[PDB]
Amino acid sequence: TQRIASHSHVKGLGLDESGLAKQAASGLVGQENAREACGVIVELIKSKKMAGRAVLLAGPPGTGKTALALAIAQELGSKVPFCPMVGSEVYSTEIKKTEVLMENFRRAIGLRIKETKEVYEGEVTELTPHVIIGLKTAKGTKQLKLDPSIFESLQKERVEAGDVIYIEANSGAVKRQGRCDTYATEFDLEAEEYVPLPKGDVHKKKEIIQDVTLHDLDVANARPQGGQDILSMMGQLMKPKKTEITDKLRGEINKVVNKYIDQGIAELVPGVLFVDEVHMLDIECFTYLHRALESSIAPIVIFASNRGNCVIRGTEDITSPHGIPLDLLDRVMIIRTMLYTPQEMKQIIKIRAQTEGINISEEALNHLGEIGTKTTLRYSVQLLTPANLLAKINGKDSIEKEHVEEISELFYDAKSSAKILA
Template sequence: MATSITAGASELRDITKMERIGAHSHIRGLGLDDRLEPRDNSQGMVGQAKARKAAGMILKMVQEGRIAGRAMLFAGPPSTGKTAIALGMAQTLGSDVPFTMIAASEVFSLSMSKTEALTQALRRSIGVRIKEETEIIEGEVVEIQIDRSLTGATKTGKLTIKTTDMETIYDLGTKMIDALSKEKVLAGDVIAIDKTSGKISKLGRSFARSRDYDAMGADTKFVQCPEGEIQKRKEVVHTVSLHEIDVINSRTQGFLALFAGDTGEIKPELRAQINTKVQEWREEGKAEIIPGVLFIDEVHMLDIECFSFLNRALENDLSPLVVMASNRGMARIRGTKFRSPHGLPVDLLDRVLIVSTKPYTEEDIQQIIHIRCQEEDVTLTQDATTVLTRMAMDTTLRYALNLISCAQVLARKRKAEQVDVEDLRRGYTYFMDEKRSVKWLKDQQGSLMFEEIGGEDDVMDQS
């Protein structure tokens, strides 16, 4: 009797469209109009109108290059959108203006000094736009001929390129043949070749070939055949951060260190030389400085030495806008016995523009829950939305948002399409919020370990 062999059904997944849904993945910008007025619900942002408008005004000055070397502080209770506003700022700035985001505690966990870690973060937030002229060959590929020797060791070839006005044949060497093969260049492609570096870029497929019976992917881009001369001089603009320039010049394998992440400490003398060179390029018109933004979350976790360093760093010529966030009230400055507003020294507070964030209203919370449900692809019934909003008011917004995906799992178990009040209630019984957790600890009556609280050190740590 023949044995039947069954193979599991294969599943094809488009990996380019897979995205991890994070806590702030719904943020697309600050949600401001052209006059910097905050919209009620836009680009994933809800409420916090004053804070968003303040952030928008600061961004406008950043884009005009007028507020480098300043600092601002978002201060407010937990779950009031401080990090969300910072991410909205990053999205609004776009990819051209550098935006670096660090948590203050990162400074202490890196294998380098605190000041070096902060210096690298500051220099990562300053972009240098370098302009240079280069010769490029641009046109539509008419034909590629490649001849191999009998052994296959040597390869020669000819490349025929045309524009609307002219056609030229180029002799190809082994390196260029390999580069064309790597880029999968075919007849009918419009390409650009950088003469100095030999880099080949595929600009797209020629419109003249759009009716050919070729197998084309969904991402095939059709472009016009270039006009004029095949060989042209073009101005190429590169944008790199000062930190990238530091790393590349710091050691022989510096370029690879950018990818490995093992940059180590960089000598101040080298940074001084790079600063001088960048200033020269700036005066000659070859480069332009783009002051970006450095966002330090939980800034009260820095110590007095870091704060002293920041005071000095903000006065440097090459300094970005430093945006900080803190949810502390009167707190001890780390590394001292003194208490100060937001856990920051008074001399640093004097330098910063402080923006306060306020707790969300019930209506704002309902809109945020609606946005998160769309982001996580969850459907709540009307009653469930009302109950979850009430939960967020009684507990915290973060706890309520965490319950959404938990409740969806429970709804799927009972084969329901929508999340109902019953699913939320079951999720609420499985997972405790902070208030119920504290109550549970008190009910345990000392059955847990290490519960003794006493002594000045413990009291100080708690404060």
């Protein structure tokens, strides 16, 4: 079974057909107003019409901001790009902060390009030095003339006659994958591996659909790895490093992708950028986000913040309602997440127990909920697996109240530790 994370139980938003939030569905409990707003946000993302619309999930810690963002990701599906990031990731040592933000903006736009892959495959018969090589398959044999670059690739693979090779003419890549199974009996022992002859035609064209971000195209065109020529090869020896991709390159990639969409050989899938802790950005990043969010190419961007009225990073004494400057709060829609009632906390704990494969009795669940009315919800949830381990060690297959009490005696919460220190 896959490992259980903090948000594994979240399968979606749990909205009905009319888009009202059910009290307990799809992992989420309560938070109806925020769930309905995230529903409207999901519709906004699915419409693919608006660029650069930003939303901020703002609320106290433990109120489901990241759960709601991941629920949006679940409702969208795997087809729609979703780029989770943290504001503290912008402090690269390699590229400037604005470039990191822009690269995340470009990651969140996806592109399905249908590409025709043509392949020459077979067992080599002749390797006459441009080269007139021959390939033989289960059907027949053909003679082909290829660029000297393909011959140099064959020499790189050290292909000898009688070997089964795979040539992708699009990328000029050759894969020698074995010696033909016909030769597999000639010697009682040889170091090579044998593989059957190919079953199709020598020259085969297959149509495939490739999923890429705009960021992939940008980085591929910025640092080319496909030159297969002396100068590009000498450049490839250099240590890899992120570079500040220019606006000219991105404009060219935009034009190429527009041509692809016009030809019908590609479809563009606007996705989401998610910045989980936006208050770790500084004033330079927020100022850049002004221009970035006003762009017509930008994705739908989601922010989450748990700070009160605190000081904006990169400034001296400027305080703002969430640590985000007032100029950027004007450009975002705000979704508020509220604190939980005890009953909602108990429902969340029960869901977490069922997700963690843990059986818990009603009395133990009630004591855990009472502990969670103190301390925090996350503390109370985190006591499930220690208590189930102590149950298993004591030979019980369910958490009892005594096991919860003992685990709460072994492990203290933040408030208790602060009281001890103070």
